[PDB]
Chains A and B, each alone.
Chain A
Amino acid sequence: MSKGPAVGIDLGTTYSCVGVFQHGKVEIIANDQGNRTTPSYVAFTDTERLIGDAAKNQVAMNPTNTVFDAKRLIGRRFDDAVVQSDMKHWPFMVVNDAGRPKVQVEYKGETKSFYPEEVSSMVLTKMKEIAEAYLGKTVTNAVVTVPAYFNDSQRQATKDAGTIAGLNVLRIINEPTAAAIAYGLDKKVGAERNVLIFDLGGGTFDVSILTIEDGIFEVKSTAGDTHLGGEDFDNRMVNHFIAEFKRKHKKDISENKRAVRRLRTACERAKRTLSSSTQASIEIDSLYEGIDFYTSITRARFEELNADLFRGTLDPVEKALRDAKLDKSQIHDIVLVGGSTRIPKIQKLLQDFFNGKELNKSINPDEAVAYGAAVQAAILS
C-alpha cells in the first residue's frame, strides 16, 4: 500500500468520526459497515477483541466485558468526583491501580485490566483502519480533537491514546476550535469575532465561547451538562408510550426488557423523523402480552414532553455569555454541533434567543468536529 494523506479524528464519548481533506473538500469516511461515525466501544470475548460497530452490536450479549465511555475516565485520577459518579452507571468494572482508574474485563478466560488510553487507542486504530481501507493507503498522520475543558492530564492521555494506536499525532485541538475551523470563521472579515458553539451530542452538552483575534482562537468560557444528550429526549418519549399503553390496555410493559427495548428503538427512529416531518407513526406487532401497538406522535407532542429539557439548553448559553463578559448581541456567529441540534425546537429556541440570527448548520453536526480536524491535518501536512 502507498503512503496516504493525514486525517482528522473526532474521538467522542459515544461515537468517533474520521475525515480526510481531498479534492478541495473534506470527505468523512464511512466504515466497513458503511457508517460515517463509529461507536466508541471495545468488547472482550472468550475468543477475540471487537471494536466499533461489532463491539456495540454484542453489548446486550456481553455487558460486563463491553467498554464504552473511556473518554470520561481518560486523564482522570480514581478519586475524581466524575470517576466515582459515573462507574455507578457502567456495567463494567473500574479498579484503582495506584490512583489511576483501569477497566476490569474478562478477556479469553483471564481477568484483564486496561488503562483508559489503551481502550481509547483501540478505538483510534479502528479509525486509522477505516481510512486505510477507503483510500487504499497507509494512514499514520492524524489530528485528534479534545473538549475545551480537558486539562493537561486528560490532553496528554489522549495523545498517549494516539501514540499506542500507532498514529503520528500532528496536533491536538479543541472540539469548539475544530467546529469553528470547519465553517472558516477564522477566514472572515473584521478584526474580532465572538463565536458561540452549541454542541448537543455524544451524550454531553458543551457551550463554548471563542474569540478569533487575527486567526487566534481564545476560549473565553465553557458551560453545559455532561449527562444531557439524545437519550434523555428518548426517555421522555418512552415514558409517554408506557403511560399511553397503560391508559389504552391497563397493562404495564416496563418490567419486560424486550418490549421496552422494542418501544425505545422505534422511539429513537420516531424522534429523527420528527426533525424533518411534523408527525411520526409506530407499528409494533405483539409488543406486550400479544397486543399490537399502532400509534403516532406529532412534533408538537415530542416538543411538549421535552419542553423543560429543551428550554434548559439556554441556561448554559446565558451562563457562558456571563463568564465570557459579552452581551448576546456581541456574538458574530452561532455554530451547531452534534446530532440533537437537528431538533427544530432547539434551533428555534436558540435562534429566538439570538433575535432571529442565522445558525451555522450546513455541515453535518455529527461531522463538524472531524471536518475541522481534517482541514487542520491538511494544513499541517
Chain B
Amino acid sequence: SNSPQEEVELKKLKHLEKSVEKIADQLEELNKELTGIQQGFLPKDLQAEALCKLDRRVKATIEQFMKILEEIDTLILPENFKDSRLKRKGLVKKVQAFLAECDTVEQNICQE
C-alpha cells in the first residue's frame, strides 16, 4: 500500500540526506587534520596553535548540522508513511552521531 504522496516526502528526505553528506565531508577533513596534528611530528609548542585553528570550521559544521535537524523537524509524517518515518529517524540519528564527533573535536582544541 504505497502512495504517490509519500514519494514527495521521500524526495525531501533524500535531498536532506545529500545535504548531510556535504557537511559530513567537511567533518571528515577536520577529523583527518585533528588526527594528523595529535599523532603528527609538529613541534609541541606549535601544536596548540594548530589545534585551535580548527575552531571556526568545527563551529560552522555544528551549526550547518543543527539547521539540517530544524529542516527535518518541520516534517509531519503520518503512521502509514512507514518508510518516510524510518528514513526520518535514521538521518536524525546519523546527524546526531555526526554532532557528537564534532563535540569531540571541540573537546580536543583551544583547551587551557
Q: Which residues of A contact B (CB under 8 A)?
A: 45-46, 57-58, 60-62, 258, 261-262, 265-266, 269, 281-286, 292
Contact check: which of B73, B76, B89, B92 meets A265 at CB < 8 Å?
B73
Q: Is A269 a contact partner of B74 (Cβ separation < 8 A)?
A: yes
Closest chain-A Cβ to B53's Cβ sits at a distance in Å of: 10
Closest chain-B Cβ to A59's Cβ sits at a distance in Å of: 9
Instruction: Identify 25 residue pairs between A and B in the complex whose beta-carbon atoms are under 8 Å apart, listed by A's number.
Output: A45-B56, A58-B60, A58-B63, A61-B56, A61-B59, A61-B60, A61-B63, A62-B59, A258-B66, A261-B66, A262-B69, A262-B73, A265-B70, A266-B74, A282-B73, A283-B73, A283-B75, A284-B73, A285-B72, A285-B73, A285-B89, A285-B93, A286-B89, A286-B93, A292-B89
Asked if B42 CB lies within 8 Å of chain A CBs, one says no
Note all chain A residues with C-beta closer than 8 A to B110: none
Q: Is B88 a contact partner of A60 (Cβ separation < 8 A)?
A: no
Note all chain A residues with C-beta closer than 8 A to B76: 281, 283
Q: Is A285 a contact partner of B70 (Cβ separation < 8 A)?
A: no
Asked if B96 CB lies within 8 Å of chain A CBs, one says yes
Asked if B52 CB lies within 8 Å of chain A CBs, one says no
Q: How many A-B residue pairs have CB under 8 A?
A: 42
Give A46 to B53 CA distance when docked, in angstroms.
Answer: 11
Name B's interface SS: helix
Give A249 to B69 CA distance when docked, in angstroms.
Answer: 22
Asked if B77 CB lies within 8 Å of chain A CBs, one says yes
Contact check: which of B63, B74, B75, B93 meets A60 at CB < 8 Å?
B63
**Count of interface residues, chain B, beta-carbon cutoff 8 Å:** 20
Give A107 to B52 CA distance when docked, in angstroms.
Answer: 18
Q: Is A285 a contact partner of B92 (Cβ separation < 8 A)?
A: yes
Give A292 to B75 CA distance when docked, in angstroms.
Answer: 13
Query: When A46-B56, A61-B59, A61-B60 are in contact, do A286 and B73 touch as well, CB less than 8 Å?
Result: no
Give A258 to B61 CA distance when docked, in angstroms.
Answer: 14
Note all chain B residues with C-beta closer than 8 A to A61: 56, 59-60, 62-63
Note all chain B residues with C-beta closer than 8 A to A284: 73
Give A233 to B97 CA distance when docked, in angstroms.
Answer: 33
Closest to A282 in B: B73
The 3 closest A-B pairs by CB, nearest first: A285-B92, A61-B59, A265-B70
Q: Is A262 a contact partner of B96 (Cβ separation < 8 A)?
A: no
Note all chain B residues with C-beta closer than 8 A to A45: 56
Closest chain-A Cβ to B5's Cβ sits at a distance in Å of: 16
Contact check: which of B56, B62, B88 meets A285 at CB < 8 Å?
B88
Q: Is B70 a contact partner of A286 (Cβ separation < 8 A)?
A: no
Closest to B60 in A: A61
**Which residues B58-112 have CB closer than 8 A to chain A?**
59-60, 62-63, 66, 69-70, 72-77, 88-89, 92-93, 96, 99
Closest to B93 in A: A286
Give A45 to B56 CA distance when docked, in angstroms.
Answer: 10
Contact check: which of A60, A62, A266 meets B73 at CB < 8 Å?
A266
Residue picked from B72, B73, B92, B96, most chain A C-beta under 10 Å: B73
Closest chain-B Cβ to A290's Cβ sits at a distance in Å of: 8
Closest to A46 in B: B56
Give A265 to B69 CA distance when docked, in angstroms.
Answer: 11
Give A286 to B100 CA distance when docked, in angstroms.
Answer: 14
Closest chain-B Cβ to A129's Cβ sits at a distance in Å of: 24
Closest to B95 in A: A286
Note all chain B residues with C-beta closer than 8 A to A258: 66, 99
Closest to B65 in A: A258
Q: Is A283 a contact partner of B77 (Cβ separation < 8 A)?
A: yes
